[PDB]
Amino acid sequence: GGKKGRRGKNDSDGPKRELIYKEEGQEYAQITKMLGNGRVEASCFDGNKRMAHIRGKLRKKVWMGQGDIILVSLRDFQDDQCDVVHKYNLDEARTLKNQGELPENAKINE
Amino acid sequence: GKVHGSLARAGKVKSQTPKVEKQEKPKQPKGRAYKRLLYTRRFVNVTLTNGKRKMNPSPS
Amino acid sequence: IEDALKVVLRTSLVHDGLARGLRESAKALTRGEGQLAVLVESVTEEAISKLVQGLATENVPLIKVADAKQLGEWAGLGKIDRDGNARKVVGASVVVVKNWGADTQEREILLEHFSQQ
Amino acid sequence: GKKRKKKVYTTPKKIRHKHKKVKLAVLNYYKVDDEGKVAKLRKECPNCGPGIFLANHGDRFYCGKCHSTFATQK
Numbered sequence: 001g002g003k004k005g006r007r008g009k010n011d012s013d014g015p016k017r018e019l020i021y022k023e024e025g026q027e028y029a030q031i032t033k034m035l036g037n038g039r040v041e042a043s044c045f046d047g048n049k050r051m052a053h054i055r056g057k058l059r060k061k062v063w064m065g066q067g068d069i070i071l072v073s074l075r076d077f078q079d080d081q082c083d084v085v086h087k088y089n090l091d092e093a094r095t096l097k098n099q100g101e102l103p104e105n106a107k108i109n110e
Numbered sequence: 111g112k113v114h115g116s117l118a119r120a121g122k123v124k125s126q127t128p129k130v131e132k133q134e135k136p137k138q139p140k141g142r143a144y145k146r147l148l149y150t151r152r153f154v155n156v157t158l159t160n161g162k163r164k165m166n167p168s169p170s
Numbered sequence: 171i172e173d174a175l176k177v178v179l180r181t182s183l184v185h186d187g188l189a190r191g192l193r194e195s196a197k198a199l200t201r202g203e204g205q206l207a208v209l210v211e212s213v214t215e216e217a218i219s220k221l222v223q224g225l226a227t228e229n230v231p232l233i234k235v236a237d238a239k240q241l242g243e244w245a246g247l248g249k250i251d252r253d254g255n256a257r258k259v260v261g262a263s264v265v266v267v268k269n270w271g272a273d274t275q276e277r278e279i280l281l282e283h284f285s286q287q
Numbered sequence: 288g289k290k291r292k293k294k295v296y297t298t299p300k301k302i303r304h305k306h307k308k309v310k311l312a313v314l315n316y317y318k319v320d321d322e323g324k325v326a327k328l329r330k331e332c333p334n335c336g337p338g339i340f341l342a343n344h345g346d347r348f349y350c351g352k353c354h355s356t357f358a359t360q361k
């Protein structure tokens with residue numbers, strides 16, 4: 001809350017958006033720990049722990065916490081680091097859990 | 111979606127820009143002729159006296 | 171004569187007298203409508219002209235102008251926006267005059283001559 | 288804001304009913320009696336007047352002009 005809200009874009013996409021899948025390098029991951037400087041640690045669904053930058057259009061536009069499903073784009077020149085591109089608000093995450101693009105051993109439910 | 115393809119792909123915009131060919135471009139006089147052309151175009155063929163000289167006046 | 175035919179086609183195009191086609195022409199001849207009929211003999215298999223003649227026996231007089239494409243051209247089927255013909259092909263192959271419209275002396279003399287035969 | 292998706296249809300297609308054009312259609316309606324008298328193969332409709340031909344499909348005759356009010360069993 002606050003007087004900040006009226007300065008915003010007022011982009012009201014409350015209705016159910018169509019979830020975006022993974023495309024040739026964009027992959028799903030889970031936030032493991034929150035770091036500083038606007039950077040996060042994402043355990044990808046491949047047995048690797050990538051370091052994902054909180055990225056443009058996402059920095060102060062959506063607020064993300066520990067244990068959040070996420071979509072992240074890799075970089076072919078440097079595999080260790082990557083960029084968080086989209087965030088799924090815990091509803092379509094269930095849908096992906098049933099469809100199982102990610103290993104179901106990562107069970108994160110409220 | 112949010113991003114059409116993989117992000118930061120080392121020259122994405124240059125890769126996907128439409129390659130537009132050069133025009134036939136008749137020969138431009140060069141040397142002293144270019145300076146004569148500029149002198150004629152600016153100081154004996156004053157086109158837009160209103161405002162500034164406005165060389166390269168965008169059409170609108 | 172060539173003049174009276176264009177005159178009658180004008181007088182029937184103005185007041186909607188042309189039965190442009192053969193089904194409308196056949197219906198007009200069967201009714202008490204078709205007062206004149208021009209048809210072309212350069213028709214393949216010739217049965218349409220025979221049917222027109224038979225319906226003409228039954229509204230009697232008929233004319234035997236050739237050049238079906240030209241017949242349609244000077245029959246007024248064309249929109250003819252320009253001075254020259256602006257359409258590729260258009261024809262009638264049978265034209266029936268129902269409404270006599272305006273009357274000219276040369277045309278009535280011609281139709282009397284054709285009735286006399 | 289509005290979040291509309293591409294519409295997906297649970298129906299193959301409905302096709303425009305193309306009119307059945309018939310070449311040399313008019314002559315089939317009539318019959319030349321050897322360079323002279325002629326007859327009509329189809330039947331005439333009384334309500335409209337002379338000339339209009341009745342439609343025969345099966346055990347009845349049907350009109351086109353006053354089509355709705357005339358369909359008489361054969």
Ligand SMILES: [Mg+2]
Pocket residue numbers: 006010
């Ligand atoms: Mg506002």
Ligand SMILES: [Zn+2]
Pocket residue numbers: 332333334335339350351352353354357
């Ligand atoms: Zn009827």
